[PDB]
Amino acid sequence: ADVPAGVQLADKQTLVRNNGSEVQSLDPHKIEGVPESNVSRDLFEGLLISDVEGHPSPGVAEKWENKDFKVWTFHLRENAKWSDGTPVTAHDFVYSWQRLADPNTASPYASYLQYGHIANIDDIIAGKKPATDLGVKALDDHTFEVTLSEPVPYFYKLLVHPSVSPVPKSAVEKFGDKWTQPANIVTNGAYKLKNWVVNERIVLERNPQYWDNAKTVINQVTYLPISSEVTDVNRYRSGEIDMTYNNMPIELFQKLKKEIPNEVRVDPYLCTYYYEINNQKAPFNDVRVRTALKLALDRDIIVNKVKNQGDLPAYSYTPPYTDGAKLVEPEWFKWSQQKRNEEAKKLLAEAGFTADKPLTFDLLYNTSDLHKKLAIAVASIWKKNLGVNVNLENQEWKTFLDTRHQGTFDVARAGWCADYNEPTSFLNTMLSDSSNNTAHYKSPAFDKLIADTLKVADDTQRSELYAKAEQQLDKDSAIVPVYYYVNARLVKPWVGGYTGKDPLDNIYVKNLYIIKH
């Protein structure tokens, strides 16, 4: 943390944050969501970390270089340690990325090493090559070298993500799937796990062995698992929470903005809210059905009438303001909603659905007052504009993510937030073999467009290919884009260091501090 000369700090440097839901896991190789990564940044530290404005900065790696953007050399700081006092070496990075790549780990982010184009990942992922073949190597204890199959200019931006953080082999090999329990876990970030009571709290305390420990201010942070955005806010107002999770209740927001204007933080956010369609299951394997649902949803009602928190109506998957995106607005988004409804109705008639034998299906969401309210509104809009009958289902966060990966659904509420600020952070998730493809979408034409982005000379050409890849995805109606998110959350006035300027929201509790109040 960089406390402003002049500010006085409080005596007790404790922080309470809501975290949206109970994490899937604390193992960096088993996580995929925002709740999981909020915890993961305070516990595990990879090669690079984000600074308070979101820029890639020194993490375990104090300095690095690249050869033709294809060979990256990371110089690890000589004092990096694990919470047990042991040294963090380039060998821990070797072992960890091999464990991420191994199909036996089953990581939802195994494909992050494919996004980075590390040599040999595809065969390793396919089980054709053993994980020991991965293009990484410890040149010496403090020198980690990565070799990629194509130049990847933004390679370093990928590295602040939890799946490329190191995991402690001794703990992992001795305790198996119990390595993350408090009595067993070994960590390397600014904090260490003090307590974890399922569905109640996660308590982290300062990790004295952190290399940047003199700059850590907050001695303890608790993360709550509250999925009701109403209860999160209520507990914030009662004084129990200093930082709400960043999902705001529709019910109370207008009230909050007028009653405590300066605690309502509302900042840019590279996330997209959409309805995920299970592309591999009839009748969702018919593009006419997918397109009719995409066109019949009325985003203006959703964004401006039901929610009205500053979200922008969406027509793509990658947010148009991502760095390096220059997207082509599609024709259907230029029409009036009435015309969208008429085309939508024709498309479903063509697919054979009647007013008397309508298309019916489940609309699944992760338990939440926000998502429930939006899904009730969406079901009514679709009923009214297209004649579809939807049945709402809700699942708890962890269960919900497992359903999506397994394909045990029809249509699901969804949100993807960038892992790095560059369009392939969104576009790589729709690749046929990506481990993050819960759309179950497979388009050889889309895969090629993305693969050609690593084979071209200039950024102009890359940017045009990302626009064509968004167009192919829209033409296939793989999803129903709804809105681009704003990052909206309540932060008490004594919480310092939360600037709201990082469009990925990669908050580190070591960078925050309690102002005396």
Q: Which positions touch U ion (CB under 5 A)?
A: 362, 410
Q: Which is nearer to U ion, 323 or 362 (CB)?
A: 362
CB-closest chain residue to U ion:
362
Nearer to U ion, 282 or 355 (CB): 282
| Residue 454 in tokens | 């690593």
Helix (H, G, I), strand (E, B) or coil at 17: strand
Nearer to U ion, 254 or 360 (CB): 360
Token code pair at residue 503: 């469009």
Q: Is 22 helix (H, G, I), strand (E, B) or coil?
A: coil
CA distances from 506 to 53, 362, 429, 436 (A): 9, 33, 20, 20
List 414's β-bridge partners, or say none.
Answer: 274
| C-alpha span between 12 and 7 (Å, rounded) | 15
Tokens of 447: 């895969």
- Please report the beta strands in 320-452, taking only residues with DSSP state E, as ranges in sequence order: 360-366, 389-395, 411-417
Q: Least CB distance from residue 345 to U ion, whole Å?
A: 22
In the complex with U ion, the residue whose CB is nearer, 8 or 336, is 336
- Closer to U ion at the Cβ: 42 or 311? 311
Least distance in angstroms from the C-beta of 403 to U ion: 12
Q: In angstroms, give the least distance from the CB of 440 to U ion.
A: 15
CB of 329 to U ion, least distance (A): 5
For U ion, the closer CB: 410 or 476 = 410
HSE toward the beta carbon, residue 99, CA cutoff 13 A: 20
Rounded to a whole number of angstroms, the minimum distance from the CB of residue 353 to U ion is 15
Provide the minimum distance between the beta carbon of 308 and U ion in the complex, in angstroms, as a whole number. Answer: 20
Q: Locate all alpha helices (DSSP H) within 176-247, ordered by sequence.
A: 229-237
Is there a contact between 427 and 318 (Cβ–Cβ < 8 Å)? yes
Residue 63 in tokens: 């300095």
Cα angle value 95/98/99 (rounded, 5°) = 85
CB of 355 to U ion, least distance (A): 20
Q: Which residue, 287 or 312, is less far from U ion as judged by CB?
A: 312
User: How far from the centroid of its chain's Cα atoms is residue 260's Cα?
Assistant: 29
